[PDB]
């Protein structure tokens, strides 16, 4: 993309901020509800709430027009290939919201049949607790993702941010080693 | 019960089990932790869920956990009608037929 | 933690030594973690708690 | 057989599979027996249904087919002998007095401690005409998990025979195509068998992790 | 003569340490020297493999923000002539997905040093 | 023929052996009668009155735990008698009125017999509106056991155990009436080695383990069957671990081995693997410093060093290894290193011991069993202290003494508390004179009695000719001779080879037929024929520089008879490969170090002194690998396929080989060499390792160490007078190597003999004096 070839400075900064503002709005979800969390996405679209208020009313049926893949459900083993295919068939930029405990970590279903978290097959940008998450929680997670998108870098800034995030992530100890106050 | 702190065990129950009743405390502890133990047996119980007969075959081996729980979810059987209700019609008619079956895949797969 | 069906609570107890007491009685919850990516909001935990120490607020 | 069907033998008080948290309580031996044959005067319409079944089936055939009759919690379960399942199913469906037109499915259950009868298939049958309900129970050994498929009599058993094969490996021979329906065809093992592990992962926590419930202690 | 370059991807530094410990400077004296490139983030791993010059990639299936199996599928769908992929699976039942990821080999957690070394040798040979 | 009586419980008839208790008959029939004070292994006491049942012809309800079955008795429990149910529920109510509302904080919660039996046989709500009895809680009765008297139901199981099972009545029911309470005397701690069993025997949270306190509830424990790795008893156990850390090890239930008992060592000595000294990665020596190395680099370096060592290599296997691990060491040495220099004796030993083990132990499994010690009319202990070594042997011997009137005789310098608890008789012998006493006992009619038994400890090896004397005594009298080592893996090592003169299955090395048989079993051309060196020979050769390399697996050099020689040997050896679990003296001097999985993380099997197989699967799934696999892949790198990728493979290979079954090797027939004579200010040193001592596997458990017996130098009154010492005053025993100072205890020993704890803190006899038992040591006051 030529927007990436643009050199740093005020030009690239303004392109980044405009792209972030544009993409946070019109963040069309993919029509990809699973399990019971899908009912909560539909409720979020329902009149009591209004997903449309965030420009997200158009649930792109095809992955091509979808920007956000709200997994929103428990991913069974047989479904992981399908979910990955859908994610791939979306086009850049792509974001994944792991709505519900099942999508995020397998939730209550810690067994063979469930994948134990969407992130096992596609990069997850926001994790959303709840079983299901009530629509306000979904909107909260979506707004957090909007904030994340707004700050998303581009071009040389994207490369530098990737390198810096790598440098930071290489050092964080694993959760298993946070033994604070354990006997 | 509710309070300024939130939803939680009512203070009356807390007082009964932590201050006054030893048997009450034992019963709370056991029924909460491992729960009741159901006499060994094998039962089939059906209800009229919105999509048809939701059946439950449940088997207990006398323990505190269900030995075997199986749901005859009506959607699972109803989906066998898709071949009859879709074959011969258009894809648009297939959409309507499937919607009429009104499957809930959670009950289908379980 | 015992009653949680999703194993979403990890708790470890410790003695309420006289030099450092955190709760009445001889035990307190030194380490208490809820894995909200495993919590299903069932509420069995608060039903289980014998001290009303654990409640469920309306914050979500 | 005539004694109640022992499905598991638990040793020691407090329903503990392991050696015992407290010494001296592990010596109790209590067999876990599912109810045996009911005395003949079955309650309600069960008596009539069995009388009709024994009338339509010959006395010899009735003896060969019906292994047990269990009236538990006012519910009738005919422990039908394998092989004869299609015959009794046809009799129940077609006979005007029985007329169990609606077979509700096939449920698999596993009894690894039930020698020669580890796998059980349960057929909940309902007669809307007479408004009656019964269950058929067919037992197959783990070594020979074959059972006659009722597809000819009750087409609905398709996707139920397939599901129970997927989750238990019960081979419903004669089934048009006994392929896996829930698990991928490439899957290894039959998940709902008791020997099949739960397959969970430890739940992570800062500084710790909780193994899956199947690995941890239990007092069933 | 070229030092084989191996990409080790895992959010957990201890999994990377274990991988880099089971494998050493040389898997065997008959094999070339080994150089390790640790990556903790999926974007960084994708960028590294885009630059190419890798003989093997070890992807942790348990990686938190982006699991290893997803990265394996992505790299085999995105990088032409990508190196063989070895995936670390967090459980036995993940084996099926390990096949779906098309990773040339799968090694369950906890990482058995000898099993990992043998799989790596088989992939490099 | 056992007499079967028959009776009806409820309405079901059953036949049981005469003398059976009603509670046991109900158990066999499947009726769950509530019980607190009853214990199958304790003599019935009928205290709690919880097990009351209605018996026809008796006005009162009868405690089923005290009622012997009768040939026509009619019994109806709470399931079929309103009177019995009412009695049991009233007893439960009276049991709960004074109980504390402590279930949330009680350690026993979730696994409490009181909770379960109150649910099953108790009322739903209290009627006790009055004031509850209260005690200060929790008071400590020892360094390990906390006592919460308020929860005590006064079932006396703790006291009844500490009196009957273990002869250690340091806890008893104090006070009277409602004030009655289990307690220690004033401050004298509960000193039993089996004190932990009282924690597992308490039906409530009264007695609790201070280590396990508040660590976990039953639901979050991963619990696995296990075998204790400490000594040769091979007790079945249940290892409970939370978040990958072992929290406790309960006694399990193996009627044929340990019934339901442990010693404190097995119960609590599990922290050794987590004290921070564990080796986590392979280590390599470079520039004189030991630094972490990749598995590949370490394996390559070790293979290169061992190949450059050709056949000049020794293999010290140690006694910790499982049977499979010992077999791996033997196979590696005799196939890869092509040497017979394999020795598991990381302790005082002799060639006579090797000959005796080959002739009378190897291949001869299950010859004597615990069930037979329980019935042997006479038991002769030679060089063996059942309490200090193999405590469950002591428990079985005490059981036999109490029930079947077993007579125990000990050829020991003095009567240890264990021997006193066995009611045994000492044959006072200065160490080194054991052969004399054993030969002199040929005419003892007590041994002539059928089923008589001789138990020979490993220490008897240190006395020249003593094992030969014991074999002669067994042959003459016909008493079955059984050899009981300290460490768990020693018998497995014998069955797996690991000795210079033995091949797997007791197959002698000095036998062409046996050698060819094993070679065929291993798919190898031929095995080494040169005689193997023992541990002492290997160490002496290495110290002289004639040994090219050493393969040391789990050996504490301090445990060797001459640890200075051992360190000199390992240092002078050009190349040292360590298969070690924790940083040790060998590790500090090794060129390559390989971390090996601890017992809790590895599959395998031990062989108790009976030769009984004691299998166990891993409890902690971890990347750590056994000695077996490390050796297998080291051999693979060396280019020889050990064919032992896993413990299952080793077990299968050993089964395929089977026992020798041919010509058994000759008896040791060693001569009874003259004992050294101690002059003025000198005494012959006696010693044996205390159960709770400075053993490495006991590290990380300060409470257990605190429970250890007080170290004291024990002397005869005359000997103490000769040196000018007084009872309780410090006494120093010294040799050119060094000195050991301990408080003196007059013990009515033979004159001129001084006894020390072999490895108790501040004693370390091998480390400090550099001599074993039977040596002459200068004695002095202060
Ligand atoms: C090109 C250029 C630069 C030119 C220069 C000038 C310039 C800049 C612009 C020129 C003009 C242009 C080109 C403008 C751009 C915009 C444009 C062209 C148009 C796009 C925007 C557009 C078409 C807007 C209107 C479309 C519209 C009305 C959309 C709303 C659609 C609605 C109502 C969607 C909601 C549907 C919904 C509730 C979805 C939930 C379903 C999901 C996800 C769950 C899945 C699911 C389902 C569906 C079950 O059935 C179910 C049943 C039972 C259990 C479970 C489930 C389950 O899991
Ligand atoms: N190779 C190997 N070494 C082990 C194993 N288990 C323990 N060790 C090590 O072996 C060394 C020697 O143990 P021991 O001489 O028996 O010391 P101890 O067991 O504490 O004391 P005693 O057994 O009473 O003599 C210790 O330093 C341990 O680190 C094992 O399974 N394999
Ligand atoms: S998180 Fe809860 S509501 Fe959402 S799919 Fe999973 S189980 Fe259903
Ligand atoms: S709401 Fe409480 S009890 Fe229920 S799953 Fe979440 S943490 Fe566990
Ligand atoms: S001993 Fe049993 S009844 Fe008493 S407080 Fe502890 S768990 Fe509760
Ligand atoms: S301390 Fe435990 S074993 Fe001892 S009398 Fe009290 S309840 Fe019984
Ligand atoms: S007697 Fe020996 S085997 Fe038994 S628990 Fe104690 S140390 Fe372990
Ligand atoms: S158990 Fe029999 S009276 Fe106590």
- Angle between helix E68-78 and helix A80-89 axes, rounded to 10 deg: 50
User: With the C-alpha atoms ordered F740, F746, F750, F755, is the resulting torsion angle positive or negative?
Assistant: negative
Distance CA(F406)–CA(F401), nearest Å, equals 4
Q: By 3-state DSSP, what share of chain F in percent is helix, strand and coil, each rounded to 5?
A: 30, 20, 45
CA distances for D182 relative to A110, B108, D155, D161, E92, angstroms: 17, 10, 19, 12, 19
Half-sphere exposure (Cβ direction) of A87: Cα atoms closer than 13 Å: 28
Q: What do you get for the CA distance between the two ends of chain A, in Å?
A: 54
Distance CA(F112)–CA(F104), nearest Å, equals 12
Looking up tokens 């519910």, which residue turns up? D75
* Residue A107, token pair as written in the block: 């939730």
- Angle between helix A10-24 and helix A155-169 axes, rounded to 10 deg: 80
Q: Do D217 and F28 touch (CB under 8 A)?
A: no
Residue F39 backbone phi and psi in degrees, to 5: -150, 130
Torsion of CA A68, A73, A79, A85, to 10 degrees: 0
**D207 contact E CB<8A:** no
DSSP H or E run through E120: helix E113-124
CA distances for F664 relative to B43, F65, F494, angstroms: 65, 51, 14
Helix, coil or strand: residue A53: helix
Query: Which residue from F21, F26, F33, F48 has its CB within 8 A of the most atoms of ligand 8, so it is best to mutate?
Result: F48
**Listed residue (B107, B48, B41) closest to B77, CA to CA:** B107
Distance CA(F452)–CA(F455), nearest Å, equals 10
Angle, CA D60 vertex, CA D56 and CA D63 arms, to 5°: 90
CA F106 to chain centre: 30
CA distances for D3 relative to D35, D115, D126, angstroms: 9, 14, 28
- Closest residue to A77, CB basis, from E13, E70, E97: E97
Distance CA(D171)–CA(D179), nearest Å, equals 10
Distance CA(F168)–CA(F185), nearest Å, equals 13
Q: Do D27 and F40 touch (CB under 8 A)?
A: yes
Helix, coil or strand: residue F713: strand
Distance CA(F298)–CA(F595), nearest Å, equals 11
- Are E and C touching by the rule of 3+ CB pairs within 8 Å? no
Taking the CA of B50 as reference, the closest ligand is 1
Torsion of CA A53, A54, A55, A56, to 10 degrees: -110
Distance CA(A33)–CA(A55), nearest Å, equals 19
Q: Contact at 8 Å (CB) between C50 and B17?
A: yes
Please report whether residue A102 resides in a domain.
Answer: yes
C1 to chain F: which residues are within 8 Å by CB? 217, 219-220
Q: Do D109 and B70 touch (CB under 8 A)?
A: yes
Distance CA(F284)–CA(F295), nearest Å, equals 10
Alpha helices (H) in F309-465, listed in sequence order:
323-331, 351-360, 370-373, 391-404, 417-421, 434-440, 445-448
Nearest CA in chain B to D136: B44
F493 CB neighbour count, 10 Å cutoff: 33
* Residue F556, token pair as written in the block: 């504490």
Residue F374 backbone phi and psi in degrees, to 5: -65, -20
Please report whether residue A172 resides in a domain.
Answer: yes
Q: What do you get for the CA distance between the two ends of chain D, in Å?
A: 27
Distance CA(A117)–CA(D73), nearest Å, equals 42
Please report whether residue A182 resides in a domain.
Answer: no
Distance CA(A94)–CA(A32), nearest Å, equals 14
Q: Do C31 and A181 touch (CB under 8 A)?
A: yes
**B39 contact A CB<8A:** no
Alpha helices (H) in F484-605, listed in sequence order:
489-495, 512-522, 535-543, 563-572, 585-588
CA C13 to chain centre: 10
Closest ligand 2 atom to residue F584 Cα is: 27
**B28 contact C CB<8A:** yes
**A44 contact D CB<8A:** no
* Residue A4, token pair as written in the block: 């990436």
Residue ranges of F for the binding site for [4Fe-4S] cluster?
99, 103, 106, 112, 152, 155, 158, 202, 228, 231, 235, 263
Distance CA(F545)–CA(F540), nearest Å, equals 9
Residue ranges of A for the binding site?
36-37, 102, 131
Which residues does residue F732 pair with via DSSP β-bridges, in sequence order?
Answer: F741, F780
Alpha helices (H) in chain A, listed in sequence order:
2-5, 10-24, 37-45, 80-89, 100-105, 135-150, 155-169
DSSP state at residue F164: I
Instruction: Name the residue range of residue A160's domain.
Output: 2-177
* Parallel/antiparallel/unpaired status of strands F245-250 and F592-595: unpaired
Q: After which residues is chain A broken (C to N over 2.5 A)?
A: none
| 3-state secondary structure labels for all residues of B97-109 | HHHHHCCCHHHHH
**Listed residue (A97, A19, A103, A30) closest to A60, CA to CA:** A30
Sequence-separated (6 or more) residues with CB below 8 Å from residue F707: F142, F143, F144, F189, F191, F193, F195, F264, F692
Distance CA(F339)–CA(F551), nearest Å, equals 12
Q: Contact at 8 Å (CB) between F391 and F194?
A: yes
Alpha helices (H) in B1-110, listed in sequence order:
11-15, 22-33, 74-78, 82-86, 91-101, 105-109
Domain count of chain A? 1
CA distances for A16 relative to A20, A26, A153, A157, angstroms: 6, 16, 6, 9
Distance CA(F145)–CA(A159), nearest Å, equals 61
Distance CA(A154)–CA(A79), nearest Å, equals 33
* Residue F5, token pair as written in the block: 């009586």
Distance CA(E124)–CA(F15), nearest Å, equals 70
Q: Contact at 8 Å (CB) between D140 and D117?
A: yes
Radius of gyration of chain F (CA): 28
The experimental method behind these coordinates is: cryo-EM
Distance CA(F631)–CA(F642), nearest Å, equals 8
Half-sphere exposure (Cβ direction) of D193: Cα atoms closer than 13 Å: 17
Sequence-separated (6 or more) residues with CB below 8 Å from residue A14: none
Nearest CA in chain A to F212: A183
* Residue A143, token pair as written in the block: 């707004």
Q: Contact at 8 Å (CB) between F209 and F196?
A: yes
**Listed residue (F162, F139, F142) closest to F151, CA to CA:** F139
Alpha helices (H) in F42-103, listed in sequence order:
82-97
Helix, coil or strand: residue F402: helix
Sequence-separated (6 or more) residues with CB below 8 Å from residue F24: D27, F16, F40
* Residue F486, token pair as written in the block: 């300290």
Distance CA(A104)–CA(A107), nearest Å, equals 7
F637 CB neighbour count, 10 Å cutoff: 20
Looking up tokens 């003695």, which residue turns up? C15
- Angle between helix F82-97 and helix B22-33 axes, rounded to 10 deg: 100
Sequence-separated (6 or more) residues with CB below 8 Å from residue E74: A88, E42, E46
- Angle between helix F323-331 and helix F627-638 axes, rounded to 10 deg: 20
* Residue B10, token pair as written in the block: 């009512």
Alpha helices (H) in F103-250, listed in sequence order:
113-121, 157-160, 195-201
Residue F743 backbone phi and psi in degrees, to 5: -60, 145
Distance CA(F777)–CA(F666), nearest Å, equals 35
Q: Do D210 and C7 touch (CB under 8 A)?
A: yes
Q: Do A178 and D206 touch (CB under 8 A)?
A: yes
Render chain D in DSSP notation, one character per residue.
--S-EEEEEEESGGG-SSS-SSTT-TT-EEEEEE--PPPS---TTHHHHHHHHHHHS-HHHHHHHEEEEEEETTEEEEEEPTTSHHHHHHHHHH-TTT---EE---EEEE-TTSTT--EEEEEEEEETTTTEEEEEEEEE-SSS-EEE--TTT-GGGTTTHHHHHHHH--EEET-S----SSS-TT--S-TTSTTS-----PEEETTEEE--TTTS----
Half-sphere exposure (Cβ direction) of F400: Cα atoms closer than 13 Å: 25
Angle, CA F125 vertex, CA F119 and CA F130 arms, to 5°: 125
Closest ligand 5 atom to residue F118 Cα is: 3
Q: How many helices (H) and strands (E) does chain A have?
A: 7, 3
Distance CA(F438)–CA(F110), nearest Å, equals 54
* CATH assignment at residue A22: 3.40.50.12280
DSSP state at residue F274: G
Distance CA(F532)–CA(F510), nearest Å, equals 10
Distance CA(D126)–CA(D108), nearest Å, equals 18
- Residue F600's Cβ-count burial label (10 Å; 0-12, 13-18, 19+) is buried
* CATH assignment at residue F744: 2.40.40.20
Distance CA(D64)–CA(D54), nearest Å, equals 11
- Residue F741's Cβ-count burial label (10 Å; 0-12, 13-18, 19+) is middle
Distance CA(F24)–CA(C10), nearest Å, equals 40
B9 to chain C: which residues are within 8 Å by CB? 46-47, 49-52
Alpha helices (H) in F576-626, listed in sequence order:
585-588
Distance CA(A140)–CA(A148), nearest Å, equals 12
Distance CA(F226)–CA(F599), nearest Å, equals 9
Distance CA(D41)–CA(F770), nearest Å, equals 87
Sequence-separated (6 or more) residues with CB below 8 Å from residue D174: D148, D149, D151, D152
Q: Contact at 8 Å (CB) between F316 and F473?
A: no
Interface of E with F in 58-117 (CB under 8 A): 110-114, 117
* Parallel/antiparallel/unpaired status of strands D132-140 and D119-127: antiparallel
- Residue F68's Cβ-count burial label (10 Å; 0-12, 13-18, 19+) is middle
Residue E82 backbone phi and psi in degrees, to 5: -75, 155
| 3-state secondary structure labels for all residues of F275-321 | CCCECCCCEEEECCEEEECCHHHHHHHHHHHHHHCCCCEEEECCCCC
CA A58 to chain centre: 17
């Amino acid at each position: 993309g030529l927007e990436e070839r643009l050199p740093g400075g005020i030009l690239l900064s303004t392109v980044e901020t405009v792209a972030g503002y544009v993409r946070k709005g019109s963040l069309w979800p993919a029509t990809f509800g699973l399990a019971c969390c899908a009912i909560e996405m539909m409720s979020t679209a329902g009149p009591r709430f209004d997903i449309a208020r965030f420009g997200m009313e158009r649930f792109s049926a095809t992955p091509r027009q979808a920007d956000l893949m709200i997994v929103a459900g428990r991913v069974s083993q047989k479904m992981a290939p399908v979910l990955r295919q859908i994610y791939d068939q979306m086009v850049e930029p792509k974001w994944v919201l792991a709505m519900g405990v099942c999508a995020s970590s397998g939730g209550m279903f810690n067994n063979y049949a469930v994948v134990q978290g969407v992130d096992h097959v596609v990069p997850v940008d926001i994790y959303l607790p709840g079983c299901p998450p009530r629509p306000e929680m979904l909107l909260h997670a979506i707004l957090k993702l909007h904030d994340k998108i707004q700050q998303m870098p581009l071009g040389v800034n994207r490369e530098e941010a990737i390198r810096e995030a790598e440098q930071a992530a290489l050092a964080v100890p694993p959760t298993i080693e946070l033994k604070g106050l354990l006997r | 019960k509710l309070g300024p702190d939130g939803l939680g065990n009512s203070p009356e129950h807390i007082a009964k089990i932590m201050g006054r009743s030893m048997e009450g405390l034992i019963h709370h502890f056991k029924l909460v932790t491992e729960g009741i133990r159901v006499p060994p047996g094998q039962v089939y119980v059906a209800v009229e869920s919105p999509r048809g007969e939701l059946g439950v075959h449940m088997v207990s081996d006398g323990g505190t956990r269900p030995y075997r729980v199986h749901y005859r979810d009506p959607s699972f059987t109803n989906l066998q009608a898709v071949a009859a209700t879709c074959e011969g019609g258009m894809v648009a008619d297939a959409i309507a037929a499937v919607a009429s079956i009104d499957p809930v895949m959670g009950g289908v797969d379980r | 933690a015992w009653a949680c069906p999703a194993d979403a609570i990890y708790v470890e107890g410790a003695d309420n030594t006289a030099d450092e007491r955190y709760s009445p009685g001889e035990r307190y919850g030194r380490v208490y973690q809820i894995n909200y990516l495993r919590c299903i909001g069932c509420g069995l935990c608060i039903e289980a708690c014998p001290t009303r120490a654990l409640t469920m607020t309306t914050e979500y | 057989g005539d004694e109640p069907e022992i499905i598991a033998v638990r040793r020691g008080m407090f329903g503990n599979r392991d050696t015992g948290d407290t010494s001296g309580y592990g010596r109790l031996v209590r067999p876990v027996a599912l109810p045996g044959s009911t005395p003949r005067p079955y309650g309600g319409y069960f008596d009539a249904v069995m009388d009709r079944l024994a009338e339509v089936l010959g006395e010899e055939r009735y003896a060969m087919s019906i292994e047990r009759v269990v009236v538990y919690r006012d519910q009738l379960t005919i422990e039908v002998s394998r092989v004869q399942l299609p015959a009794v199913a046809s009799v129940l469906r077609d006979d005007p007095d029985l007329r169990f037109e609606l077979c509700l499915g096939v449920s698999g259950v596993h009894y690894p401690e039930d020698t020669g009868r580890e796998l059980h298939a349960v057929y909940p049958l309902m007669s809307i005409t007479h408004n009656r309900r019964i269950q058929l129970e067919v037992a197959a050994p783990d070594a020979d998990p074959h059972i006659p498929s009722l597809y000819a009599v009750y087409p609905t058993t398709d996707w139920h025979e397939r599901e129970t094969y997927d989750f238990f490996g019960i081979i419903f021979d004669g089934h048009p195509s006994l392929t896996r329906i829930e698990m991928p065809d490439d899957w290894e093992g039959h998940p709902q068998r008791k020997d099949y592990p739960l397959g969970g992962i430890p739940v992570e926590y800062h500084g710790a992790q909780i193994p899956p419930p199947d690995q941890r202690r239990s007092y069933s | 003569s070229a030092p084989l370059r191996i990409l080790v991807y895992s959010d957990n530094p201890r999994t990377r340490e274990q991988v880099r410990l089971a494998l050493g400077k040389r898997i065997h004296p008959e094999l070339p020297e080994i150089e390790y490139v640790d990556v903790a983030t999926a974007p960084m791993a994708i960028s590294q493999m885009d630059a190419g010059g890798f003989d093997l990639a070890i992807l942790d299936g348990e990686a938190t923000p982006a699991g290893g199996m997803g990265v394996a599928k992505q790299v085999k769908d995105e990088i032409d002539d990508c190196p063989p992929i070895l995936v670390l699976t967090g459980r036995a039942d993940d084996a099926w997905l390990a096949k779906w990821s098309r990773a040339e080999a799968a090694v369950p957690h906890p990482i058995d040093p000898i099993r990992l070394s043998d799989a790596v040798v088989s992939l490099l040979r | 023929p056992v007499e079967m009586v028959s009776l009806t419980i409820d309405d079901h008839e059953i036949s049981v052996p005469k003398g059976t208790l009603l509670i046991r008959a109900a158990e066999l029939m499947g009726i769950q009668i509530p019980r607190f004070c009853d214990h199958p292994l304790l003599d019935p006491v009928g205290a709690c009155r919880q097990c009351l049942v209605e018996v026809e012809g008796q006005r009162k309800p009868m405690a089923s735990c005290t009622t012997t079955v009768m040939p026509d008795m009619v019994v109806r429990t709470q399931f079929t008698s309103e009177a019995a149910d009412k009695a049991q529920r009233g007893v439960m109510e009276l049991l709960l009125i004074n109980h504390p509302l402590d279930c949330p904080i009680c350690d026993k919660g979730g696994e409490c017999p009181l909770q379960n039996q109150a649910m099953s046989n108790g009322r739903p709500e209290t009627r006790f509106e009055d004031v509850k009895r209260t005690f200060p809680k929790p008071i400590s009765i020892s360094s390990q056991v906390l006592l919460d008297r308020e929860r005590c139901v006064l079932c006396a199981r703790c006291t009844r155990f500490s009196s009957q099972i273990a002869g250690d009545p340091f806890i008893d029911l104090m006070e009277r009436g409602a004030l009655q309470q289990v307690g220690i005397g004033q401050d004298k701690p509960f000193q039993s080695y089996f004190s932990g069993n009282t924690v597992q025997i308490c039906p409530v949270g009264a007695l609790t383990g201070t280590a396990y306190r508040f660590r976990a509830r039953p639901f979050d424990l991963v619990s696995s069957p296990s075998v204790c790795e400490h000594c040769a008893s091979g007790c079945a156990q249940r290892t409970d671990h939370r978040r990958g850390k072992v929290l406790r090890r309960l006694a399990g239930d193996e009627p044929e081995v340990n019934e339901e008992w442990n010693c404190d060592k097995g119960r609590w000595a599990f922290t050794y693997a987590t004290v921070g000294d564990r080796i986590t990665t392979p280590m390599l020596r470079d520039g004189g410093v030991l630094r972490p190395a990749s598995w590949s680099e370490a394996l390559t370096v070790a293979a290169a060093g061992l190949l450059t060592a050709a056949g000049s290599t020794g293999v010290l296997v140690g006694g910790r290894c499982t049977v499979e691990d010992a077999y791996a060491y033997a196979k590696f040495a005799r196939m890869v290193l092509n040497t017979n220099d394999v020795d598991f004796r990381a302790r005082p030993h002799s060639a006579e011991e090797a000959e005796f083990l080959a002739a009378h132990v190897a291949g001869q499994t299950m010859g004597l069993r615990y069930a037979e010690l329980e019935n042997a009319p006479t038991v002769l202990l030679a060089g063996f202290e059942p309490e200090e070594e193999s405590p469950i042997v002591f428990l079985r011997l005490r059981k036999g003494v109490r029930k079947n009137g077993v007579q125990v005789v000990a050829v020991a310098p003095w009567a240890s508390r264990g021997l006193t608890k066995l009611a045994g008789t000492v044959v006072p012998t200065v160490p080194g004179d054991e052969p004399a006493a054993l030969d002199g006992m040929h005419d003892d009619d007590r041994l002539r009695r059928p089923g008589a038994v001789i138990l020979v400890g490993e220490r008897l090896a240190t006395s020249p000719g003593a094992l030969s004397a014991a074999v002669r005594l067994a042959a003459a009298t016909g008493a079955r001779l059984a050899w009981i080592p300290r460490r768990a893996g020693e018998r497995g090592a014998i069955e797996a080879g690991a000795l210079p003169n033995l091949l797997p299955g007791g197959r002698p090395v000095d036998d062409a037929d046996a050698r060819a048989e094993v070679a065929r079993a291993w798919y190898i051309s031929a095995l080494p024929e040169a005689p193997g060196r023992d541990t002492a020979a290997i160490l002496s050769t290495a110290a002289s520089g004639h040994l090219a390399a050493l393969l040391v697996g789990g050996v504490e050099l301090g445990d060797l008879p001459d640890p200075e020689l051992a360190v000199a040997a390992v240092r002078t050896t050009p190349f040292v490969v360590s298969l070690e679990l924790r940083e040790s003296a060998v590790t500090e001097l090794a060129d390559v170090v390989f971390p090996v999985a601890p017992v809790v993380e590895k599959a395998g099997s031990f062989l108790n002194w009976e030769g009984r197989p004691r299998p166990f699967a891993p409890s902690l799934k971890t990347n750590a690998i056994p000695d077996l696999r490390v050796l297998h892949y080291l051999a693979d790198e060396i280019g020889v396929d050990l064919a032992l990728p896993t413990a299952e493979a080793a077990d299968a290979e050993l089964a395929q080989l089977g026992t020798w079954g041919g010509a058994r090797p000759p008896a040791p027939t060693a001569p009874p060499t003259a004992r050294p004579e101690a002059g003025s200010g000198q005494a012959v040193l006696a010693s044996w390792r205390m159960l709770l001592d400075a053993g490495r596997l006991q590290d990380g458990e300060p409470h257990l160490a605190g429970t250890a017996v007080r170290p004291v130098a024990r002397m005869s009154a005359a000997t103490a007078a000769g040196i000018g010492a007084s009872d309780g005053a410090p006494v120093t025993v010294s040799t050119e190597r060094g000195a050991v100072t301990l408080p003196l205890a007059v013990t009515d020993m033979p004159d001129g003999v001084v006894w020390l704890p072999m490895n108790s803190p501040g004693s370390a006899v091998h480390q400090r004096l550099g001599v074993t038992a039977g040596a002459v040591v200068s004695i002095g006051a202060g």
